[PDB]
Structures are given as structure tokens and as C-alpha cells.
Design a protein around this ligand. Structure first.
Ligand SMILES: O=C(O)CCC(=O)C(=O)O
Ligand SMILES: O=C(O)CCC(=O)C(=O)O
Ligand SMILES: O=C(O)CCC(=O)C(=O)O
Ligand SMILES: [Fe+3]
Ligand SMILES: [Fe+3]
Ligand SMILES: [Fe+3]
Lengths: 275, 275, 275
């Protein structure tokens, strides 16, 4: 096996090209760069610039106005820990399809457009993962993809321990190479590409497809920023319990079918550590 | 905003005074000192002295007689890890409303009285949090407050990573300032007050009130002792799922209402780390 | 109390001997060595040798063929983290009663026989724990013991933080003493014995017996290998909620009975840290 992290054109995949290469990538590696998906550094620049201005120069009052009363990183501003501040180590801004907290109309306009482009690209590449593996989710493809996404931008003025994601797919845009993944048993660099987004397959891809997609571990070594988009299923997403057991899930589920809520519990869990 | 940690008289709050100051404190800070609540260093001294005597001079046999067969820190004596002993780093004594383990009748009498005073003060200040925010829990106020409290005394012959509490409220009495909380975006000292208890609002205050109360992060830096009282809801405490989502809870709950058990699972979880 | 870790003959226990010594060991210590159970270094040697050959000399392709697409350590090969590899720190091989991944017919034959001997010994010693404590599980003894075991072999070319196990029982065979447990309040060595297996009682022993069995904390200090066999209950294992509370379990369970799934959730959790 070549341990190269491949690149695919979303448009070419949607035209039915490279299907054998794509299927092999999904099973053996579970990560790839994606071009021709409506996301490049051009779309990132406006959003990145205005949130860094907010991190660096917004006042405490402005920040409090867009901070949730519980520090979950679901929506709005968060100072994130590893005299002073938890913001000394890192700062985050989070959003979803609704219940958002924006510091101004300008920010709102720019970040709503950026979110929509990310959400569209993530549903599109998940649709191709499903098609290439012959997978029809219980309840159908479009209701599975109309889901509960989370976007988080993180600024760092290990940075992240080794883990796998529990998403369907995760899309990463970035600004020494900090991001690393296991490929062919060795740590492999994942540098930025101005022309492409990085796609990690998550454990829900593995689950829905019956084990045809790998969910790879990755870590962040030690300024930098990243945009991380999690495509996450609805709580009522339903799957086969025996099939989950056949591809490595250590479930404690009675009965033949279960939901995402049954498996994970009452709160989303975005990442998991093997150790 | 002034980043002063305020002090309120429980008696004055119950008389209907300072309601605007109290409401602003709950939303913007989520912590305060509480006087005139039946708890001062006078009530702490007997309980503190006899448990330290037990930690320092009780024998292994005496300690085993009040150690649970599973090391959960729910009831009785625990040596708590960060040749030797896990007790080398810290020692704990835990109790609740029933199923307690006491090393003697003297200890039992002193600690039952101390627990009752803490439980009374915690229900009283939670009642004022609910009243000041116009909150009627599903099932009513008194059945919500007749709940599942946990008292833990900890001796240290970071000491605790940054976290928020998942209680309704937490009451802390203490014996260089080790306890720190985020206030106005900066780490703020929380020293002892012989005349007052420190109150942290927890995530259940945020949840029941629909987001009108902040649950602040805090940490313990590096001998010292502390008494920590968690006022925790019953497993059947029921809330609105859409309202929880509107104030930052990243729930994975199908349907319009849920219970505390639905959210947290089958075991109490007292603290949560953002990271 | 003597803080000696005792040794029992499985055959002698099954003949009804040493019942008072055995009961006292279970309540006060919750660990012991077990002889005369069909497990010695003779049965370990073939299995150990062929998996170390695989770790050291199998190629990446061979390893990928027996790696699950999600890195859960449930089945097959795993590189386990604390340029390079996560395999640099440790390597694991896992199996159960079905859905196994074997690198060859030789390996399969040797490891299926080894698993069967471990599973038999673990059910046998759990049967004696139940008998000695007068315990009839809901649904009966044999359906409780026909369960969901997990075998993991780990090679290390703290190694493990202090924890207790959430199994019924755990059986350990091993190849400076790395493994340590709390006994009588002090860290006590658990060296290998060519003629015996080490048995840890887990929290499910405590639960099913109503608090008559201790689940002791233990840790691994810092090459070495170990074989660790977890005897884990079925998801539908049912117990009394008030009795669980009386022996230290901090449950958040409405109602009078619950299942293992109700308590732990939708995924097995094998170990728990007090801290
Ligand atoms: O910051 C990055 O590039 C990666 C973060 C990541 O893997 C995550 O948040 O799951
Ligand atoms: O020991 C203290 O003062 C604080 C402990 C604390 O925050 C907790 O146990 O939640
Ligand atoms: O490796 C050992 O000897 C112990 C491992 C252990 O306690 C566990 O995996 O629970
Ligand atoms: Fe990730
Ligand atoms: Fe706390
Ligand atoms: Fe263990």
C-alpha cells in the first residue's frame, strides 16, 4: 500500500469517476483531500479575519454577550484550557443551523455564508461515501444527512491527544506541520492546501456502511488556526446491533436495532480516545 | 462589569431585597458568598476536627469498617489519588441523607448535624435562585429540592483541573489562595471567609431556569481542607429539550421532554471539563 | 489483618473447602491467585510466542487485514498510545467468543484453545464467588455466566493509571514488579506465578452479591506482556436499584430494578478511575 493521502474532485466523484480508487481509500485509510467542492482559502479569508479580530480586540462585554451560560462550546465564544485566563491557551467560536450567537450583523452575514458552504460540502461528500459503498440508511439518505452539524473555529495564540472522530465525516480547513494522522501504521503529515478541504471519516461512517469505511486516529502536535466542521447524525438515527458488533463496536445494547441516542447517550460526544 | 465576587445575606434575599443585584450576579457570574444562612466556621470546627483526627490517627481496621466495597466516594472513607498509598495524595469522607458509614457515635452525631445545616442552606439558596428567575420546575419547587445531595470533605496533607459543576448549586466551606474561578474572563481568588459559605451555581441551575444562571468554571491550584456540598436533582427531574438546546446544552435527545437520567445516564456525574 | 495476597485451589473451593477464608478474602481484599484451574505458563507459551512474532515481524499488510475499521480494541490488532507510530508505545491483540480476526490458521487454532481455557476458568471462579456469598442472580447463575467476555494481550516493547475493573472477575497471566494493588491501605506487589492466574474482582461482583465482594484499585508502574481476560455481563443483566445504592453505587436510576445497559450505557466500559 502507498501511504499517500489522496485527493479527489467532488465533481468527478459525482460524475461516477474513480469509484475503485475512492472505495479503496475509504476502507484502507478513511481520509482524503477534497477539491472542487465550493471551499478554498478564498471562502475562508473573510470569516477567519473577522473572528481573529474579535478574539484579539473584542472587549470583555462584547465577548460575554456571545458566551453561553454553560461552557459547552456548542455556540458562541469560548476560552479553552489545555493569574491569567483560560483564553490564554486557546480561543474558540462555534455555530450550527440555529440558536447562534453573533457579535454583529457583519460577522453574522459572513459566518452564515461560510457555514452554509461547509454544510453543503459535507453533505455532498457524505452522499458520495454512501453511494460508493451501496449504503441506504434506515429512513433514507436525505433524512440521514439533514442532521445536527457543529462548526468550531479554534485559535492557538500535544495540542490535541490522539483520537478518532464520532461524526459521519469531519471537514477541516487550516491556516512545521501540526496535524498528523495514522496512515499505513506511521504518522503522516496533513498540511494545509489552499485549494482543498481535508476530510476525516468518523465512526458513524463506519457504522452506517457496515464496516466499509475506516475511522482513522489523528492528533495535533505543538500560532495556528483551524476550522473544524462535524457532520453529526440525528438522535433517532437507527442501525442494526449485530452488524455494529461485526465491525468492531463494543456495544452493550439489548435487542436487534438501536438509535444513536441509545449508543452515545443524552449528550453529543464528538471524539473518542482508544486509550 | 466589576469582577468582584459579591456577597449576599440569605435573610435579606428571603425578605425580597437586592433582587436586581442578585439576578445580575446569577446571569453574569454564577457565584457569590452567602452570609446569614446558619453556616460559619463555628459550625465547621467540630466536624473538621474529628474527621482530621480520623484521617491522621484512625487505624487501618477502623478505616476499612467505613470503606465501601466499590471506591466511588459516595459514602464513607476514601484514599484519593491524583511503595505508598493512594491516601498519600489526599483523603476524603462522604455522606448523604441515608446509607451512611460512621466510625463512632460521636462522629455520627457531629456529622449528621453538620450535614443537616448544609442541606438546609443549600435548599434555601436554591429556592431563592428559582424565585428570582421566576422558575417553577416541572413537578413543583419542593419536590425538585427534596433531592439527592452529596457531601464530601477532602484533606490534602493542579489539585483539581478546570471544570464546571453539574449540580443545582454547590456550597463550599474552606480551611496563598488555592481556589480560583473565571470571573470577567480572568482568574479570580476565592479565599475563605469565616462568616460565609461560597456558592457555585451548577449546570442544573442553568438548565431549570432556561439559561438565566451561569455555571462558572473553576480550579484548585497547588496543606488544606475543604467541605463541598452538591445539591443534585432526582433522576426523574424533567425538562424541555428545545429550551435546553437554546441555552447551550449539546443534547442528543429525541422528543420534546427528557429526564436527568436520560441526559446524564445511569450514574451521577458531578463535574465536567470543557476540554 | 494480614495484607498477604492469598492463593486458592479452584478444585478445593469446588469441593467445599476453605469457605470462611475465601469469604473473608472476597470482602476484605477482592483479589487472589488461583491454582488448579487449567491455566499455567504451559498453556500461555504457545499463544504468547506466536502473537509476539506477529507484533515484531508481521508486515503492515498482514496487520491491516486483522485491524478493525474503528480502533476500539474489541477484536484483532491495535497499536495503543500512552515521526513514529502509536505501536511504538504498546501493541494489543483482542478476541471474544465470535467475530474474531486471525492472521493465520495456526494462530487461530492456538488462540481459540487459549481463549476457551481462560473463559472456562473465569466462569468457574465466578461460580464459586456466587456460591460462597449465597448469590442467585436474577435469571439464574448459568445465564448470568454465559456472557460477553473480552480477552486482550498487551505488549510494552505510569503504564496504567489507578483504576478498578467493571467486570464480574478479571483473570491476569503475566510475563521489578510492574502490577500493584491496594491491600490493607498500602501498594502491594502482584508478581507473576508460573503456576497460577491472578484474579481481580470487579464492580459487577460487588453489585450482584449486594456488597459482599470488594473491587480493588490497581495500577501498572514502569519490556513486559500481560494477558487480561474480562468476564463481562450481558446487557440485560438485571439488579435491584436500592441494593446497589446500599453498597456504594452512585446511581441515577428511577424505579426499583435496572439493567447493566441502563447503568453503563450503550458501550461497554471496562475500567473506572476514582479520580
Ligand atoms: O485542529 C485540527 O486541525 C484538528 C482538530 C480535531 O481533530 C477535532 O477537533 O476533532
Ligand atoms: O476543594 C475545593 O475547594 C473545590 C472542589 C470542587 O470544585 C469540586 O469538588 O467540584
Ligand atoms: O497489564 C496488567 O497487568 C493489568 C491491566 C489491567 O488492570 C486492565 O487492563 O484492567
Ligand atoms: Fe478529530
Ligand atoms: Fe467544582
Ligand atoms: Fe484493571
Amino acid at each position: 500500500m502507498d501511504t499517500t493521502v489522496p485527493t479527489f474532485s467532488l465533481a468527478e466523484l459525482q460524475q461516477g469517476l474513480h469509484q475503485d480508487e475512492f472505495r479503496r481509500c475509504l476502507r484502507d485509510k478513511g481520509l482524503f483531500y477534497l477539491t472542487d467542492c465550493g471551499l478554498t482559502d478564498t471562502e475562508l479569508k473573510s470569516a477567519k479575519d473577522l473572528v481573529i479580530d474579535f478574539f484579539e480586540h473584542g472587549s470583555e462585554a462584547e465577548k460575554r454577550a456571545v458566551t453561553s451560560p454553560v461552557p459547552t462550546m456548542r455556540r458562541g465564544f469560548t476560552g479553552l484550557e489545555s493569574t491569567g485566563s483560560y483564553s490564554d491557551y486557546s480561543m474558540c467560536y462555534s455555530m450550527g443551523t440555529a440558536d447562534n450567537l453573533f457579535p454583529s450583523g457583519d460577522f453574522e452575514r459572513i459566518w452564515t455564508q461560510y457555514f452554509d458552504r461547509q454544510y453543503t460540502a459535507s453533505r455532498a461528500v457524505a452522499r458520495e461515501v454512501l453511494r460508493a459503498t451501496g449504503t441506504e440508511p434506515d429512513g433514507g439518505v436525505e433524512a440521514f444527512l439533514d442532521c445536527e452539524p457543529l462548526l468550531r473555529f479554534r485559535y492557538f495564540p500535544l495540542r490535541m491527544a490522539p483520537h478518532y472522530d464520532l461524526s459521519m465525516v469531519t471537514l477541516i480547513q487550516q491556516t512545521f506541520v501540526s496535524l498528523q494522522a495514522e496512515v499505513g501504521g506511521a504518522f503522516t503529515d496533513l498540511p494545509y492546501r489552499p485549494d482543498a478541504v481535508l476530510v476525516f471519516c468518523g465512526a458513524i461512517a463506519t457504522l452506517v456502511t457496515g464496516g466499509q469505511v475506516k475511522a482513522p486516529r489523528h492528533h495535533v502536535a505543538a500560532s495556528r488556526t483551524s476550522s473544524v466542521f462535524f457532520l453529526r447524525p440525528n438522535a433517532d438515527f437507527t442501525f442494526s446491533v449485530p452488524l455494529a458488533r461485526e465491525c468492531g463496536f463494543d456495544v452493550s445494547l439489548d435487542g436487534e436495532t438501536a438509535t444513536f441516542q441509545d449508543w452515545i447517550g443524552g449528550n453529543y460526544v464528538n471524539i473518542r480516545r482508544t486509550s
